[PDB]
């Protein structure tokens, strides 16, 4: 996944900043590029699958993880080792089939607050550490069924991925 699941983080943090009607990817300007590594397949639908479902379950656990991120109050010079401690615990409670979109919820709540602190430089660092963990402990264990592509199977049959072409009529 490497860069694909990293840009998955970037747009997911944008969706979190949308609480304010904002995106840090506006500053990055890469919403014009429209890259996001979607492969033009269905791996694009991953972010929307994790958006609808992940944020639905989140709401209760969102205020709960706001109380977690209240401890992880992002001050000038907060060591990411505090977050790494929460991510450590996260792995021990499970390999994170659903707790992995909750991993995006912790770092997402952090990135809302760190932009709110004008530590958007720490946001890009949080997206880096998240992407690191993703390709480090999660990536094989999830990639067996996509991890996130399971959510995609249930919400879309990749029927839209077939029709994504559309261009067969041009001949």
């Amino acid at each position: 996944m490497s860069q694909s699941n990293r840009e998955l983080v970037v747009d997911f943090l944008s969706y979190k900043l949308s609480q304010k009607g904002y995106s840090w990817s506006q500053f990055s300007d890469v919403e014009e590029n429209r890259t996001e590594a979607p492969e033009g397949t269905e791996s694009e639908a991953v972010k929307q699958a994790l958006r609808e479902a992940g944020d639905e379950f989140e709401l209760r656990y969102r205020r709960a993880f706001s109380d977690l991120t209240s401890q992880l109050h992002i001050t000038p010079g907060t060591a990411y080792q505090s977050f790494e401690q929460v991510v450590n615990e996260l792995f021990r409670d499970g390999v994170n089939w659903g707790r992995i979109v909750a991993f995006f919820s912790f770092g997402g709540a952090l990135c809302v607050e760190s932009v709110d602190k004008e530590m958007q430089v720490l946001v890009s660092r949080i997206a880096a550490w998240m992407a690191t963990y993703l390709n480090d402990h999660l990536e094989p264990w999830i990639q067996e069924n996509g991890g996130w592509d399971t959510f995609v199977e249930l919400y879309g049959n990749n029927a839209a991925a077939e029709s994504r072409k559309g261009q067969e009529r041009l001949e």
């Binding site: 479902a53 639905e56 379950f57 499970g94 919400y155």
Partner: peptide, 16 residues
Amino acid sequence: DGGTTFEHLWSSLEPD
């Protein structure tokens, strides 16, 4: 069964 996609998913996924 419910079959409500997300609601059912997270209901069973919540207590791991």
